[PDB]
């Protein structure tokens, strides 16, 4: 039809984090923008820095609107994350392409029957090694969590020999073991 924008299943919110406003973690979160079409996603993506050009200590988070990008949210507190850990050199080679693929997985509803279990994703730019993660709502749904992990691994193009792990947020927040691996 040409003149109609292509709507997303969900409205998404993009958040930025930098540790330069407050000594309390959550007061450093900024809501950047919300979008609910493919066209509006790309308009936003085109305006913002690549993750590799952010100062160490910064995060982007993309979460379904209504879910705050923190453990304490009702939809994250029983949940967990699939974690991708990058070495320092992968900031250059893999970080930006992995983050974009992650964004496309989310907005495109790429987890078929288990897409509702996905809450969001987070990229941490860190001097010790960058991290990307997909956050899901219930760490005890073995079927949903494992399916999501397998989709994610396939979409990043990681070979069978590379193993990724899922951690519950409850475990991450306690002073971490994997609940699942794929």
């Amino acid at each position: 039809e040409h003149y109609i924008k292509h709507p997303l299943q969900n409205r998404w919110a993009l958040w930025f984090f930098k540790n330069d406003k407050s000594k309390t973690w959550q007061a450093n979160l900024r809501l950047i923008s919300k979008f609910d079409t493919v066209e509006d996603f790309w308009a936003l993506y085109n305006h913002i820095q690549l993750s590799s050009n952010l100062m160490p200590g910064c995060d982007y988070s993309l979460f379904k609107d209504g879910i705050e990008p923190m453990w304490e949210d009702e939809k994250n507190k029983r949940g967990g994350r699939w974690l991708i850990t990058l070495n320092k050199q992968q900031r250059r080679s893999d970080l930006d392409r992995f983050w974009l693929e992650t964004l496309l997985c989310l907005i495109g509803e790429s987890f078929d029957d288990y897409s509702d279990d996905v809450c969001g994703a987070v990229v941490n730019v860190r001097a010790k090694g960058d991290k990307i993660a997909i956050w899901t709502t219930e760490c005890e749904n073995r079927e949903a969590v494992t399916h999501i992990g397998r989709v994610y691994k396939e979409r990043l193009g990681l070979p069978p020999k590379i193993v990724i792990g899922y951690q519950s947020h409850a475990d991450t927040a306690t002073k971490t073991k994997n609940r699942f691996v794929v």
Binding site: H6, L8, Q9, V38, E39, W42, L104, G108, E109, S110
Partner: peptide, 13 residues
Amino acid sequence: KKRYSRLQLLLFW
């Protein structure tokens, strides 16, 4: 109902 392939999303860029 709204699912997009990788291909589709990139084309729309």
